[PDB]
Structure formats: structure tokens, C-alpha cells
Amino acid sequence: GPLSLSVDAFKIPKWEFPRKNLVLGKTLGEGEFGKVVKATAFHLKGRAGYTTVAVKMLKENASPSELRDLLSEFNVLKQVNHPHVIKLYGACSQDGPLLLIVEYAKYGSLRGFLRESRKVRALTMGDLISFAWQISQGMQYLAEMKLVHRDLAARNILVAEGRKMKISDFGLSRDVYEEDSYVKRSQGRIPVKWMAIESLFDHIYTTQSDVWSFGVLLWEIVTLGGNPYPGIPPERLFNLLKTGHRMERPDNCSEEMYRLMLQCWKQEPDKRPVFADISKDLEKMMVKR
Amino acid sequence: GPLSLSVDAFKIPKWEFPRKNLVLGKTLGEGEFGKVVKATAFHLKGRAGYTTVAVKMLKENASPSELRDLLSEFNVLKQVNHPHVIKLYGACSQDGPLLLIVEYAKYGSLRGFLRESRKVRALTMGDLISFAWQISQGMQYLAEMKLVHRDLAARNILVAEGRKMKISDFGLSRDVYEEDSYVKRSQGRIPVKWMAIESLFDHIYTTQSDVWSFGVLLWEIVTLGGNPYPGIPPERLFNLLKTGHRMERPDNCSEEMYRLMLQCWKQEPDKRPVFADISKDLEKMMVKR
Numbered sequence: 001g002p003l004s005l006s007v008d009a010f011k012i013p014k015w016e017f018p019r020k021n022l023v024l025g026k027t028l029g030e031g032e033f034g035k036v037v038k039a040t041a042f043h044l045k046g047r048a049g050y051t052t053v054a055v056k057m058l059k060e061n062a063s064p065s066e067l068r069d070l071l072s073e074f075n076v077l078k079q080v081n082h083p084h085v086i087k088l089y090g091a092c093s094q095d096g097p098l099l100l101i102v103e104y105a106k107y108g109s110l111r112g113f114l115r116e117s118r119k120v121r122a123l124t125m126g127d128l129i130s131f132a133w134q135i136s137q138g139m140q141y142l143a144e145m146k147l148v149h150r151d152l153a154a155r156n157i158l159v160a161e162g163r164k165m166k167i168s169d170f171g172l173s174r175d176v177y178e179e180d181s182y183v184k185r186s187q188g189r190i191p192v193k194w195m196a197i198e199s200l201f202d203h204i205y206t207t208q209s210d211v212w213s214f215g216v217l218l219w220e221i222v223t224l225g226g227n228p229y230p231g232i233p234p235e236r237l238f239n240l241l242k243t244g245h246r247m248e249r250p251d252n253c254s255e256e257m258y259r260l261m262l263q264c265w266k267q268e269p270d271k272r273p274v275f276a277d278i279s280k281d282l283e284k285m286m287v288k289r
Numbered sequence: 290g291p292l293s294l295s296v297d298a299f300k301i302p303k304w305e306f307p308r309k310n311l312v313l314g315k316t317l318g319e320g321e322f323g324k325v326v327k328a329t330a331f332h333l334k335g336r337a338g339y340t341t342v343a344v345k346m347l348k349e350n351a352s353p354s355e356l357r358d359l360l361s362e363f364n365v366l367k368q369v370n371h372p373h374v375i376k377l378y379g380a381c382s383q384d385g386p387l388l389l390i391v392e393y394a395k396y397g398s399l400r401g402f403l404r405e406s407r408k409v410r411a412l413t414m415g416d417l418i419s420f421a422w423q424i425s426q427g428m429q430y431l432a433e434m435k436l437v438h439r440d441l442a443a444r445n446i447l448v449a450e451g452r453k454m455k456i457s458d459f460g461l462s463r464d465v466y467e468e469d470s471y472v473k474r475s476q477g478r479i480p481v482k483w484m485a486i487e488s489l490f491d492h493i494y495t496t497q498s499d500v501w502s503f504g505v506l507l508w509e510i511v512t513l514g515g516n517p518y519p520g521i522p523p524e525r526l527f528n529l530l531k532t533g534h535r536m537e538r539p540d541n542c543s544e545e546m547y548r549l550m551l552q553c554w555k556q557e558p559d560k561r562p563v564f565a566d567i568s569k570d571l572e573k574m575m576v577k578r
């Protein structure tokens with residue numbers, strides 16, 4: 001089937017890194033299909049000595065779906081280059097488990113980062129605006145590359161040296177040059193509280209649904225890593241969304257900032273801003289303190 | 290789409306149990322889509338007082354796929370009744386998260402049970418034969434009900450009072466009355482080292498692929514919860530299987546018992562035994578000590 005084809009195609013070099021020059025350490029976390037360890041790499045891509053890196057691999061008892069997801073992420077990270085997208089350095093596919101070697105972000109996920117802090121780490125409203133703007137810059141680049149990310153959420157943004165945002169977790173990202181949408185027949189593996197209404201009901205993914213997710217991500221940033229639709233079971237989402245309900249304005253959120261989330265949540269996909277608009281909105285709030 | 294339909298259909302009574310008569314306790318474990326807690330239920334289905342039960346629910350940030358899986362398991366457990374299939378008592382769908390209330394197996398999963406023991410808990414070869422035979426009895430009942438389980442593995446068999454086997458985890462089970470196969474277009478969410486060769490390559494599931502999985506389950510029992518194809522990455526499975534390689538005879542395994550696993554692993558699905566044969570084989574080994 002499609003996977004045995006990919007696996008053989010794959011197994012039969014700008015990117016291959018020798019296993020014996022990689023040393024694995026502590027677990028940094030598990031996503032939906034991969035597990036990430038901290039690692040160090042010897043003589044990696046022209047850098048002398050060791051370089052601290054992160055490594056993605058399959059978990060115990062990986063399913064065909066997870067393997068496909070990992071090969072997919074690999075295939076996306078090859079094409080992609082932007083100071084706010086996590087950077088890929090190589091892979092080991094030749095004599096052990098499949099491993100992806102990516103850029104190490106020292107502060108971990110944005111969720112964890114935000115949950116460890118408070119608002120006056122002490123973060124200003126400016127820092128949060130700055131975080132949202134960086135991610136938005138990255139999204140505009142991907143939307144231009146014609147890639148739908150699909151899984152935009154605070155747990156999937158990493159925080160690197162300098163508090164730089166890195167968009168992460170490309171297992172579920174899809175190419176949309178041809179038709180400007182990705183449509184998936186069976187049920188998506190993306191959490192329901194981050195999905196656009198039309199992805200939920202109709203299985204349609206576009207850059208405009210990434211904007212929806214970004215809106216939820218904004219809610220996460222502004223609340224310092226709160227849980228969306230708190231206390232509401234995911235199954236109530238169908239009806240609550242289609243009857244026009246949205247999350248209430250959170251505390252420590254200006255009128256203009258809440259207007260931007262509501263706008264990312266418009267039922268009609270074409271009424272939502274594009275990432276360039278979102279970027280221009282956050283810049284404007286930044287400069288007005 | 291198909292899910293919003295199910296969720297509404299569902300939300301709009303032999304099985305409904307009042308939430309306020311259920312009290313939740315410690316986590317017992319997480320599967321691929323659900324999380325299970327220990328629980329106690331007041332006045333459950335004609336039983337006076339409290340009854341210790343297990344409860345399945347959605348994890349944090351459940352995806353449409355996981356929700357569908359949970360509704361599916363619910364829909365299967367309603368139809369099913371056998372002393373070696375986990376028993377369903379009710380659900381709470383009316384004013385909180387969706388919860389399935391099932392029979393509590395006090396020894397947990399068979400994997401954990403077996404890994405905690407040694408071979409002379411001290412378990413005889415007879416006890417292991419007895420375990421395999423019970424599971425096989427349950428599988429014959431399901432195959433007769435025209436249900437493909439799909440996810441047969443030691444982690445998905447529970448051990449109840451009296452060391453009774455209970456087949457568990459019905460999220461992925463499918464009806465096959467009409468056509469005697471379940472075929473899934475996209476990539477399965479079942480671990481690759483338990484899948485039949487034709488499920489791996491061609492996405493075909495039948496009672497005969499359940500037999501394949503059972504063969505792997507037998508390997509797990511006989512090794513006291515060993516890890517299949519140890520040290521071999523799941524992605525090498527395509528080629529290793531299609532070139533006719535299988536797991537070597539493990540230690541503490543008779544010739545006749547190893548013959549039964551190889552037979553469950555025959556490339557051609559029609560050359561594998563049916564569960565009734567498997568049952569008759571294990572009975573025969575039992576009685577010859």
C-alpha cells in the first residue's frame with residue numbers, strides 16, 4: 001500500500017547523518033505520534049565538535065499511521081526554512097530506528113513556557129504580542145509555501161534561545177498548491193477545541209482554518225497557557241460552535257485583542273483575516289503600547 | 290459529517306446511568322484513545338450499594354478520531370456478552386464528559402500481569418495455556434458475532450478475579466456480517482508488530498488477521514510479556530515479513546506450541562487456523578501436560 005511504497009522508496013543524502021555520531025539523552029516529551037529526546041551530534045553539517053540537538057523518533061509499538069506521520073514531517077521539514085520554523089539538520093535511517101535530528105529549543109514548548117510564568121518569568125503584554133507576531137510571521141511564510149499546518153496550538157510552538165518562537169510538529173501538515181484545501185475523509189487526529197468549524201463538520205483544511213487555530217493559540221498566549229473552552233467536553237463543540245458561541249473575552253485582554261480572536265473565529269472562512277492582516281494587527285497593538 | 294451525526298443522534302436508556310451515582314478515583318492507565326480510571330457506582334443495574342467498576346473517558350484534548358473511537362467501543366460493548374469479553378454496565382452522556390462504565394478486572398492488563406511473574410506470581414506452562422485458551426474462546430464468540438477485533442495484544446486483555454481473561458479495548462472493532470472483511474483506506478492506528486501481513490500491506494482486516502494477532506499474543510504469553518521482534522524497528526517489518534521471516538521459537542516453548550504460532554503467521558490467510566482449531570490445539574496441549 002502507500003506506506004510500504006514510501007518505506008522502500010525511502011530506504012533504497014543531503015540529509016543522512018551517521019548514527020555513530022549521535023548520542024541520545026533525556027526524554028523531552030511525547031506528541032501524538034513521536035517522542036522527542038535531547039541529543040548531541042558530532043560534526044553536524046560543517047559545525048566542529050558537538051552540537052546540542054533534539055531528536056524525534058517513533059514511540060514503543062508505533063502504528064502505520066505514526067510511521068507515516070513521521071516520514072511526512074521529515075518530508076515537510078526538508079522544504080522549509082524560516083527563522084520562525086523549527087530547523088531540520090538530518091536523519092538516521094540506515095541502521096536503526098528512524099530518527100529526525102532537529103534544532104533544539106531550550107525553553108521547550110510555548111505552553112509549558114507560558115504556564116511557568118506570570119503577567120506584570122514575568123511577561124509584559126508586549127512580550128505576548130511579540131510571541132504571537134513571530135508565530136504569525138511563520139504562518140504567512142508557510143501559507144505562501146502553500147502548506148496547511150493543521151495542528152497549530154501552544155504545545156506545538158517551541159521557545160528557543162532569545163525567546164524566539166519556532167513553529168513545530170509538521171506530522172500532519174499538508175501540501176495545498178493544487179487546490180488550496182486539504183480534505184480528509186476519515187476523522188482527523190487534531191484536538192477538537194483547536195479545529196475550525198468547517199474542519200470539524202466538513203473535514204476541510206485550509207490556511208483559513210489555520211487562522212482559526214491561530215485564534216485559539218492567541219487565547220492560549222493571552223491567558224498564559226489556559227485550557228480552551230474550560231470545563232466543556234469536546235463533544236459539546238459541535239453544537240456550541242454551530243449555534244454561534246465562542247470563548248468569552250479572557251482577563252488581561254484588551255478590546256482590540258479580543259476583536260482579533262473573534263475575527264479568527266468567524267463562521268465564514270473568507271471573513272477571517274489572513275496571516276498578513278494578523279501580523280499587521282499585532283504590530284499595530286505593539287506600537288500603541 | 291459522520292461524527293456530528295453520531296454525536297447529535299446519541300445526545301437526542303437501557304444504558305444511561307446517573308452521573309451523581311458514580312464516584313471516580315485513581316487512573317488505571319491510558320490506551321490509544323481513552324483513559325481508564327478506577328471508579329465506584331451506586332445502585333448499578335439492580336446491585337444494592339456500591340460496585341467497584343472501571344470507567345473509560347476521553348483524554349485531555351481528544352481529537353474527532355478519539356471521540357469516534359470511544360462512541361464505537363460503546364456501540365460494540367452493547368451487543369456483546371461472553372464470560373471472556375469485558376462487560377459493559379452503562380454510560381454517562383447527559384451532563385458532563387462521556388464516560389463508559391465497564392467491569393473492573395482487578396489484575397489489570399495481561400501484559401503487566403505476566404511481566405510481574407516468573408515461570409516454574411509463579412506460573413506453570415499450564416496456566417499460560419489456560420490463558421491463551423480463554424482468550425481463544427472469546428475470539429471464537431466474536432468471530433461468530435461477525436466482529437473483527439483488530440487490536441488483539443497482551444495490553445488489551447485484562448485479568449479479572451479468579452485469573453479470568455477478558456478481551457478488552459473495542460474502539461477499533463468492526464462489523465463484518467456483510468462482506469467478511471473490513472478494509473480501511475488510510476493508515477491503521479494498530480501497532481505494526483501485531484498486524485497481519487495483508488493488513489500491513491493491503492489494509493484488509495478479517496477474522497483471519499485477528500488470528501495473526503493472536504499468534505503474536507501467544508508469543509507474548511509464552512515469553513511472559515516479552516516485546517515482539519525485539520530490537521527490530523517497525524519500519525523493517527514490511528520487508529522482513531514479505532521475505533518470509535517470522536519470530537524465532539522463544540525459550541520455554543514446546544515444539545507443538547511454536548508450530549501453532551507459525552501457523553497463525555502463514556502468509557496465506559486461509560492457511561491459518563480458525564479460533565475453533567486454535568482452541569482445540571490448546572486443549573490438546575493442556576491434557577498432555
Ligand SMILES: Nc1ncnc2c1ncn2[C@@H]1O[C@H](COP(=O)(O)O)[C@@H](O)[C@H]1O
Nearest residue numbers: 028029030031034036054103105109169
Ligand atoms: N526541538 C525541540 N526542542 C525541545 N523540546 C522539544 C522539541 N520538539 C519537541 N519537543 C518537546 O516534546 C514534545 C512533543 O513534540 P511533538 O511530538 O513534535 O509535538 C513537545 O511538546 C515539546 O515538549
Ligand SMILES: Nc1ncnc2c1ncn2[C@@H]1O[C@H](COP(=O)(O)O)[C@@H](O)[C@H]1O
Nearest residue numbers: 317318319320323325343392394398458
Ligand atoms: N476494566 C479495566 N479494569 C482495570 N484496568 C483497566 C480496565 N480497562 C483498561 N484498564 C487499564 O487501562 C489501560 C488502557 O485501556 P484501553 O484504553 O481500553 O486500552 C489498560 O491497558 C489497562 O492497564
